[PDB]
Amino acid sequence: SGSKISMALQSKAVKSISDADDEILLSANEKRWLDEGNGRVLLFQLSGPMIFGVAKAIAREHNAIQECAAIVFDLSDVPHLGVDASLALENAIEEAAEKGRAVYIVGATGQTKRRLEKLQVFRFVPESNCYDDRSEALKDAVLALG
Amino acid sequence: SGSKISMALQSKAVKSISDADDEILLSANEKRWLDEGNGRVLLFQLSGPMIFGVAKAIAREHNAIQECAAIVFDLSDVPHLGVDASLALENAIEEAAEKGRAVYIVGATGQTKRRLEKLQVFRFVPESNCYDDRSEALKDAVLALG
Numbered sequence: 001s002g003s004k005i006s007m008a009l010q011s012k013a014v015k016s017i018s019d020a021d022d023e024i025l026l027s028a029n030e031k032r033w034l035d036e037g038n039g040r041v042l043l044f045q046l047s048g049p050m051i052f053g054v055a056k057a058i059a060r061e062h063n064a065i066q067e068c069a070a071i072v073f074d075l076s077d078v079p080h081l082g083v084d085a086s087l088a089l090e091n092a093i094e095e096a097a098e099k100g101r102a103v104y105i106v107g108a109t110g111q112t113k114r115r116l117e118k119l120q121v122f123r124f125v126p127e128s129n130c131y132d133d134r135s136e137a138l139k140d141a142v143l144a145l146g
Numbered sequence: 147s148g149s150k151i152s153m154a155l156q157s158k159a160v161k162s163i164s165d166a167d168d169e170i171l172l173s174a175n176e177k178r179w180l181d182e183g184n185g186r187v188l189l190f191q192l193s194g195p196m197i198f199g200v201a202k203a204i205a206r207e208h209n210a211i212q213e214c215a216a217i218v219f220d221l222s223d224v225p226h227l228g229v230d231a232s233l234a235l236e237n238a239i240e241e242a243a244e245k246g247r248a249v250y251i252v253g254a255t256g257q258t259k260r261r262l263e264k265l266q267v268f269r270f271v272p273e274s275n276c277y278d279d280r281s282e283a284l285k286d287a288v289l290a291l292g
Contacts, residue, residue: 003194006170009185011177016162016169017200023162024152031157033284039155041287042214047223048149050258053234054163068188077193088199112196138179141187 007061009068015061070141071096074134076107081115090119097124102144104129104137153207155214161207216287217242220280222253227261236265243270248290250275250283 002020024045026034034043052060073089075081081089096103103125108116131137148166170191172180180189198206219235221227227235242249249271254262277283 001194003196004169004192005200006189006191008170008172008180008189008191009183009187011172011181012167013185014165014167014170016164016166018162018164018169019160020162020194021158021160023150023164024154024160026154026157027281030281030284033281033288034154035157037216037284037288037291039159039210040214040291041155041216041218041284042211043152043154043218043220043284045152045154045220045223046150048147048166049226049228050149050151050224050231051226051228052230054151055234056230064185065188068186070183070187071190072187073190073192075192077191078196080195080197082195082197084198084202085196088201089196091199135173135176135179138176138183138187138189142179142183145183145186 007065009064013064068101069145070102070104072104072106072134072137072141074106074137075112076109076132076134078108078112079110081112083115086115086119089116090121093121093124102129102141104131104141106131106134106137153211155210159210214247215291216248216250218250218252218280218283218287220252220283221258222255222278222280224254224258225256227258229261232261232265235262236267239267239270248275248287250277250287252277252280252283 001022002018004016004018004020006014006016008014024043034041051057071092093103105116105121105125108130147168148164150162150164150166152160152162154160170189180187217238239249251271254276
């Protein structure tokens with residue numbers, strides 16, 4: 001099912017990026033011709049309303065999350081964390097400390113947890129802000145808003 | 147069910163961006179607490195291997211598609227095209243003309259087609275490169291490669 005990141009401010013305000021194959025529906029025949037192109041043919045499938053281009057859509061999302069007071073990172077479904085991605089996650093955590101945002105981490109285990117340990121994430125996230133329970137983290141985040 | 151853009155070089159090399167609600171799975175209880183946050187709590191849901199950060203993942207995909215000789219835009223499922231998005235589409239079509247890439251357009255109808263008509267598009271995409279049949283466009287793109 002590949003990899004996915006989803007960002008949600010609200011139950012009906014969800015933005016996601018994915019490299020899963022099933023995100024597009026291709027007939028066997030279509031797959032046949034796409035693959036025959038051997039990477040030389042790029043298929044853009046667009047669905048639903050297309051209001052803003054990619055750049056401004058991204059910018060609108062950036063503006064939308066500037067006022068978040070708490071970030072919950074759910075890593076339950078992450079079986080492996082690369083070095084670069086771990087540094088990206090550390091950067092977000094550090095940015096959060098500089099702009100005044102609380103940080104919670106859910107479900108880090110195995111190699112993913114080991115990698116985060118080496119970054120010394122604990123300096124910014126206390127053990128009390130780590131959970132195995134996503135809904136408990138969300139609840140605590142909300143209640144600690146003020 | 148929201149909007150989605152999927153890009154595919156190969157049947158198993160698909161990249162997608164989406165604002166569909168169902169891209170994340172939230173229990174009713176989780177939705178209740180997220181929405182109680184009133185946009186003040188940002189949930190990051192990560193799943194599958196996380197190798198590179200977002201920036202470098204973007205750059206890797208950009209490097210992967212600079213080799214494309216043909217671009218097929220499938221607009222069958224687009225019921226409305228905003229002004230900015232239409233200009234972003236026009237820009238991609240024009241970049242394609244400058245870098246030597248063939249352009250095909252599938253399933254433009256209704257307002258989406260009307261907006262495209264206003265936007266100079268016939269100058270770059272001849273009527274023979276417009277299709278209602280996605281598999282036929284892919285086949286023709288491939289066959290016209292060389």
